[PDB]
RNA sequence: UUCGAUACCAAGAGCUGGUGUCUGAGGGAUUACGACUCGCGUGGUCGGACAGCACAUGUUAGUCAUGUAUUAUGGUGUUUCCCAACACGUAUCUU
RNA sequence: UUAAUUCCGAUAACGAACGAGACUCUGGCAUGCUAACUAGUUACGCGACCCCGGUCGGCGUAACUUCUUAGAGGGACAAG
């Protein structure tokens, strides 16, 4: 019974939205819910230098993009929360369902 | 390096002349007060605002406050 | 599956197909009014938003263009047929669309309107849209061989600081005239709505709104309101 | 006669807010201080200190705004500026219950006479009061204060199960607790209200605001009686167990009046006169009555409590 | 007799450690070993600090079991000497008198301040044009 | 040395608190219906109140509008899928 | 006077705008909050050893969130 959904997001409060949505709907549908555990953000740097060519004084840009990870895991059969999970999809949040 | 700007300074005066009978002595008090009177969109700039209100309110019972 | 990316390099490769995707557009629909694209990855389908201004050229004759687009974006970028639906939506407010200004501009000054004419006609269409303060610089080979800098500016306009981010919406673009690359950057300064629909929600982090007390009258001596 | 002092408490760190006496220990008091703790003292009544800061209840986030005890003597409810309550038992000082569902400061909290209802006033315009297993039984916002809530109290008297609420709209709002609903407005004051308390006989209210005029409305009828004007703000108010006394905090000196004959019964300043050079007094904050209303407690700003005792 | 657990941590550097106090005879050990073997040697009385001054007496009615990960040698020892100090003053306060917490405290903080108070510092970044966070590379005019 | 309040138990009482019987006042989505786009399919969006009913009908309202079954702009009954007493409603079990 | 055309004062100027500051990211504080078999703890039972205890990154599941993670708020303002 136990099913784990992974929330993946470059946005926190559009991930946080997500996540706070199919926690009330696992409440409200009378479902054995472990809480979002958030695992650590991914923090793809990359640094380049910010001239096209060779002679500006030394300068260099620092690109960052943050990824962030939840899950929360579900003790229910397949398709109650199926209907849930297909309810509140976002354009920016990432969605993983596994079953066992 | 604590010279507060015009912005601080400004929002200070036209808080007490607006709101005088609320805003007192105590700092956390009128924090709370100018937290409410006012949509100020940031908490440093709530926080440097409501310091330099009970600093002015502080000098007013003294006397001659210009601004 | 099988092959399995990481999510670095997933939400990397997702990001690649927006840089691309957007440049193809761009490089087409520049001369149809053509704002922005948004991807939806609805289950099992890729439902891509195109946001123009004038709709019935992006769309072609009954679908022609949209089914041409459809066809070319699924052969290279691998997808399943069926799972590519494109849906064309006019941006209501275009005055206040950077590119939508940047690229209308470019078509007039190689059409043959003015570059004075041009930039003001830009500039006045801008300010009456209700953008709080624009900016239009058109530089290049401008009245003979060497180069110059014109620069059009009314109302409020800020420069540094994150604001910069969700007020500023900016568009840098390059035209072909016979002399060589004119280069355009028109800045368009958002107004604040608490609607959040033409500008953003977020008031700037140093405009202090005070309310203002309503001005009553103080009861003199004890009264009371006794009721059940 | 007179009302004289022996010395000062020192076990604060913040500004003593408020105090909680019990009837069946009259050698312990609480105060809740500007810190995140609630000190429990044990009183000696010796030479070097009248009492000594027995425990230290920790474990909020903010400052403590109010301490109140239970008729038991193994409960102490307070309520904090973090919007939470903390239903402690003083035989360690260990966390039994917390209440959650104000959202801003809470600001003043109650018990019943029976220990069973709890009612908390906050810097939301929300009266909430609750069961005694901290779940909202109900609040009210609708026909309520248009400003802070400051103090909330209940019945003494609850053959009239009522409830006093003062706030920052500069009226007292009188509710049935048959149904938590308005009976009578207390309309006449001229600035935001700190404290009301509830004569201990449960017929009459007192009402101490900015301007520093204590109003003594009725309870038995929707009507006021007369007023008091203490000259400075008045901080807390407090009544006598035994006497037909008022006690009021008149910013940095408490004044205590006879009610027979509208006439200071004493006054009392600190003449230790430690503000000479230059600075405004450290004031009075709240003050309580012991079990018998012979010994005074007031918390002050400068982390102290000083005990006053009726010599006569 | 009942529970009398308290675990509190202390942090000097990015190193930290956490100390279990609990009745006991007096038994202060790290990962296993006495105060005696804890490296290097040369930072014994750094260890021996709050058992010299507050003595024995106090501490020989509880154990403490610390156990430490992060930072260097010298940071990790300022992080245990911290650790079993904080530990005793919050077992002192929550399990017997409030004066005897008052006690120790006023002893400990008016010695040193840092075996109760983190030292807040942590290594600033490094920017380019430069081999370290302010030093910069060699300019060279001519 | 008589006059009125205080530490307690017995005679049941009420109240509050626990628990929960019950109706749904409401609250929501979406799908019914309402539109605007249309490349004709959708897409967007009002999200049950705005949406229409069949003269079926819950009540009557100037007695004058009407041109005296009559639809006034009585404006409220029929009626989709969920959570529902802070809607402090009340059953039963107890303080 | 300030890090600053940063303010106060003087004042035929008054009231404002961009840059400065605010802003964003990060650094440090929470024995408070919501949560963790992809983090760990304290106990507990078995198992090994030294003489009831000592150590256990040996094993295994009841409490939990101090330790680790990342979300929300709180916190500092020349406030005393």
Redesign the pocket.
Known sequence: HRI?I?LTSRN??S??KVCADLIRGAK?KNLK?????????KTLRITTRKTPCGEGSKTWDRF?M?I??R?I?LHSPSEIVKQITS?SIEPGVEVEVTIA | ??????????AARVIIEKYYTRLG?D??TN?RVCEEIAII?????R??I???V??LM?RIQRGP??? | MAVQISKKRKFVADGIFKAELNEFLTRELAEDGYSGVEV?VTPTRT?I??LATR??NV??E??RR??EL?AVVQKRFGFPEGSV?????KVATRGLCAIAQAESLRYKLLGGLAVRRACYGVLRFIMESGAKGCEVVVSGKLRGQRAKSMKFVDG?????????NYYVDTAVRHVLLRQGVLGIKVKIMLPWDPSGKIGPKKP???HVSIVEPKDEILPTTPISEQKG | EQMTLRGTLKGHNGWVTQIATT?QFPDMILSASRD?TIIMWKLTRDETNYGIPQRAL?????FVSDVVISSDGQFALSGS??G?LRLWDLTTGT?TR?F??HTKDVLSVAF?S?N??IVSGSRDKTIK?W???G?????VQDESHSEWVSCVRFSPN?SN?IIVSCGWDKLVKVWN????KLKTNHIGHTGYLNTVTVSPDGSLCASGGKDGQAMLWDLNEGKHLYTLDGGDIINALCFSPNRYWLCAATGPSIKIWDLEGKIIVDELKQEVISTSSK??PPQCTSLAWSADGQTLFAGYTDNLVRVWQVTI | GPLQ?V???G?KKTA?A?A?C?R?NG?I?V??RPLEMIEPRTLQYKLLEPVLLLGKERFAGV?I?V?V??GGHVAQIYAIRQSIS??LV?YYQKYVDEASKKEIKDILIQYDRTLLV?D?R?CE?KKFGGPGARARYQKSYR
């Open positions: 784990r992974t926190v409060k991930l946080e409200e819910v472990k809480g979002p555990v958030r695992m650590p953000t960052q943050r962030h990870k899950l895991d309810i | 390096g604590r010279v507060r700007t015009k912005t601080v300074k400004k002595n700092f956390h924090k969109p940031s908490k440093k700039l926080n440097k409501a310091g330099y009970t600093h502080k406050v210009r601004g | 939806r439902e938003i195109i709709t019935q769309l072609g009954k679908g949209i089914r459809t639906e494109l849906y064309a939506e409020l306009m800020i420069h540094s600081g994150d604001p910069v700037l982090p140093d | 009837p995140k920790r474990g909020h986030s903010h500026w973090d939470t966390t917390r959650v569902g019943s029976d069973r209802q009061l069961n005694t297993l779940v909202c039984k109900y609040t609850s199960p607790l048959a149904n938590c600075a405004e | 657990s675990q509190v941590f942090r930290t956490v279990h609990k006991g038994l050990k990962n296993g154990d079991r156990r990960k992060g904080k530990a919050a983190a807040p942590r970044s």
